[PDB]
Design a protein around this ligand. Sequence first.
Ligand SMILES: Nc1ncnc2c1ncn2[C@@H]1O[C@H](COP(=O)(O)OP(=O)(O)OP(O)(O)=S)[C@@H](O)[C@H]1O
Ligand SMILES: Nc1ncnc2c1ncn2[C@@H]1O[C@H](COP(=O)(O)OP(=O)(O)OP(O)(O)=S)[C@@H](O)[C@H]1O
Ligand SMILES: O=C(NOCCO)c1ccc2cncn2c1Nc1ccc(I)cc1F
Ligand SMILES: [Zn+2]
Ligand SMILES: [Zn+2]
Lengths: 229, 229, 279, 348
Amino acid sequence: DKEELVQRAKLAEQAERYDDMAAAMKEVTETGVELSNEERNLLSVAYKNVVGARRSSWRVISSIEQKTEGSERKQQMAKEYRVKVEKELREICYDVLGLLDKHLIPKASNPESKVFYLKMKGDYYRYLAEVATGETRNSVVEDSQKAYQDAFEISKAKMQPTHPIRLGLALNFSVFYYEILNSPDKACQLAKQAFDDAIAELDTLNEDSYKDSTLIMQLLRDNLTLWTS
Amino acid sequence: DKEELVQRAKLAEQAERYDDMAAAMKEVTETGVELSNEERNLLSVAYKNVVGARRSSWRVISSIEQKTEGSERKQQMAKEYRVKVEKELREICYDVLGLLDKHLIPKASNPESKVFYLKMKGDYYRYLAEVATGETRNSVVEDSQKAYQDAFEISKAKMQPTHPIRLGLALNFSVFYYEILNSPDKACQLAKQAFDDAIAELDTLNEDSYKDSTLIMQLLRDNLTLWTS
Amino acid sequence: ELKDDDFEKISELGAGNGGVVFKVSHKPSGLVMARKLIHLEIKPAIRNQIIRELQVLHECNSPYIVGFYGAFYSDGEISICMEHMDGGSLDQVLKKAGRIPEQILGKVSIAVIKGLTYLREKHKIMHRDVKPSNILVNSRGEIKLCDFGVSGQLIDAMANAFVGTRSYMSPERLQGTHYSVQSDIWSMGLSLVEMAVGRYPIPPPPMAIFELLDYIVNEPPPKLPSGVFSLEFQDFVNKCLIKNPAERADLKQLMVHAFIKRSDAEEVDFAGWLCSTIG
Amino acid sequence: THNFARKTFLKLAFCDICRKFLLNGFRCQTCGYKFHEHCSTKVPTMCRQRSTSTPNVHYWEIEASEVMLSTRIGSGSFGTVYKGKWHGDVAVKILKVVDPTPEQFQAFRNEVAVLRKTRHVNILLFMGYMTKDNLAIVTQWCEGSSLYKHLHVQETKFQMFQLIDIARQTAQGMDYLHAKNIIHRDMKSNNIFLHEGLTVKIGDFGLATVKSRWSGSQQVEQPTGSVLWMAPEVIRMQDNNPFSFQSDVYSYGIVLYELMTGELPYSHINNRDQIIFMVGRGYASPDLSKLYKNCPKAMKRLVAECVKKVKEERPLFPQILSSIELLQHSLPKINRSASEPSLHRAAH
Ligand SMILES: Nc1ncnc2c1ncn2[C@@H]1O[C@H](COP(=O)(O)OP(=O)(O)OP(O)(O)=S)[C@@H](O)[C@H]1O
Ligand SMILES: Nc1ncnc2c1ncn2[C@@H]1O[C@H](COP(=O)(O)OP(=O)(O)OP(O)(O)=S)[C@@H](O)[C@H]1O
Ligand SMILES: O=C(NOCCO)c1ccc2cncn2c1Nc1ccc(I)cc1F
Ligand SMILES: [Zn+2]
Ligand SMILES: [Zn+2]
């Protein structure tokens, strides 16, 4: 049943329909079986495309909304549709977060899995941060910061600095610091320390972890260059 | 206001969300008023994207179904997924056809509008024809052929050889001939006649619509080269 | 101090890829001037830099180098006021006469060598454009060089020129290798061979500019037709047309070189010949 | 580095290998490299076919006495531009040809008719020609400054989306030109004008019979115009008529490069003959490291392909337009900090 469901998730991924994949993996992990590496990777990518389609839609609608704030009534419809997209964006994230708190995070019997799921939770509260405004923004960014710090401590304690998941966690932590927490200096410092602690020990990567690790390093390169100031 | 749904669908278009665009365009045409040039294009594009996503999904699922070549339940679940996306595809096609023959084709005074709607009808019946095999295949094939011929007569009579609608109808009808009716000879004949008639009046390519026209001409060239070999 | 409104054109002195030169009259001093109009569009600060580096030309005075009155920017053009030359450039006399007799050829070559040596030693200013059209002769017999690269920024700005038909560049400059006054010596030698024979002697007795560059880069240098020139002139043009700058001789060898001292020793009344052939 | 993932392109997309229409294929997430499923075999990663259906959509001359020539504006490779007031502000170019050959004149008349047949938003109008004041042509006057003057002498500051839409408008103009079977020889920034401040107007297109000198009753077939924007294959002139669509693509690529760097190519070489020799032999190319840091990879890739040394590898202008519009649509998505992308989700 679980193997059938993961095969269905792969098929839905190859078929470009991600909502079916998201539902299939969600009800894969609702059962309560130990989530292996490929399963949790499929879950993360499924929810990532599902959330990212609507996230890009939200970016587009906000950008087209802020072309000229002093305009006609049409902007009201634009903001109403943006609020509708958020209403169709916050609840999906909420589903992922509840799935993490109820099932994923609790039965995590591997420190790599634990830091991966905590990075997931921080990521999804970070996604909630942009759509949230006012005190709700502060409340959601508190959860994202706590999840990120908890992931950071275990990543230091258990994993290597060159581990691709650890590098991704550091990258996402820096993105969280200067996109919401508006701490460009601290975010750049975090990116630089992750970078130099990673390149201080090179040519020791696993053959499978060759493309991904260097890909995250190049992403860190661009982000540092983008906000060197 | 009916214009409100119009630029709501347009905003969903630049937001990449085509399911809301399809529903908005459906509601707009449900009002029973004649569509403008922009709204008709918007509706055709919206449902084109909606059916195209499911068509690509169906092609992929059928390709893995033919690719596994084993003895298990994997092909059974692949067939289940295929038939699910197939019934979803049929629902979309029947919805757009019911829109077509109850609000668009019956109310089409401008002949070019009639060619566009008949071309859409033939396209969608072809879409159901390549997914439905059996006794019901012949009926939808006949409906698509009749709609294509009805569009063909009007395009030949009151449409310029370089019009994007006429060239697109010729391309779609030749694809119908080659794929559905498996006859390459008459498909090549029709496509050759269309291309030659387009080449004759080559100089008649205004600034308002030239890119689409030459795009269709290039696609006709590619289709000829593919068929003749 | 030079302005656009103070000058009016009398006729057209010459034309080329760089620009067009007109004869104008200076009101304060009452002498006819050759005003070169080169069209170029660069930054105002670059305009000031070009004017400043052209102001170096005030102290570049020699009997074998054309003088300099002043340079100013009127409208999208760098107007350079030069000492008007009556006998034009050697290109006009090549158009008029079938070929330059060897004596005046020696005279112009020694004039070029002396002037460019003067420039190298007293100003270190690179000519870079030693061409038959860039060397001028007078009715009285004075020969002076013109249009040398005092302003490197002017060179950079003029880099965006149009494609020409003929070239007088040494093979080492086209390849981008190190270039010295040796390249100017090559260019002078190629110009001399241009003068001696009656045509552009890249295909030695309808050819693309890039094809000419390929000819002068990947083929042996041309040689003048033997039997109608002195052996000293032959060895002069052979030594001057050497692909490798190392084996080619520098200015010190040119000054002592045999054809040079033989040309200097002879006295030729070429002013009258020139006035007859251009009048 | 190619993050190839299956993607069904719902917009106007063209394969980057076969340069044909692409509707299902694989797209790289970080840059945007796209290709067909069948093209995968012939894909040089460097970071069964179904018939294609319909994609988604959405006075003979001028008399000289009628014109009045105002103060001279400037000079060029083959003409001198003057301000005119013939039915409004116009531009009159006095061609350098003094005594046109009768065959040359007939060919020029054919070409001026061909150029008169064109009318597009992104190009300057061609009104006609005159014969009294030697050989002259009349084009639409653009009160706006040239793109070359905007970039270098005036140094007008432009944000990156403005640069992108300028490139889009130029590509639209040249796509229209190539649609009418017109090879815009001599294409550079001095011929691009920022009308009304931002709108791109392309001028000085065609006119092969006038730009090239005539050695009697036959065309010389010699290069003419600025060296920096000239294509390698026309600089070489190993063929009698190397002017084609790809030479215009290379010229547009040089324009793109100087747009995305703010400086002319080969800035370290300051002599025209050396530039000719290196560009002809392939020794010199517009170095991309000068491109702006904030430049999207897609623009860097596009300007890389547009200036390809081999003529056949240069994409046609419809492809360039499609890539530019795709980048314009992707601009709102990627205009912020980047996060962890999808990992190794590649097929086969
Ligand atoms: N002082 C002067 N007196 C008389 N004529 C002159 C004077 N200065 C320049 N000229 C003429 O104007 C022309 C200007 O062209 P130059 O720039 O000197 O050389 P050129 O012929 O343009 O070489 P290229 O390769 O075309 S740039 C000369 O060739 C002469 O014919
Ligand atoms: N339609 C126009 N409207 C306004 N200024 C123009 C127009 N056409 C040319 N100019 C100006 O004329 C000068 C350029 O002269 P041109 O002879 O066109 O040289 P060019 O720009 O190098 O183009 P060519 O001749 O095709 S090599 C510049 O000052 C331009 O701004
Ligand atoms: O004009 C030039 N070369 O000629 C070919 C095309 O113009 C020329 C080229 C480079 C240069 C650098 N600084 C001044 N430069 C020139 N001008 C010039 C130089 C010396 C004198 I005395 C008088 C002049 F007008
Ligand atoms: Zn890539
Ligand atoms: Zn392809």
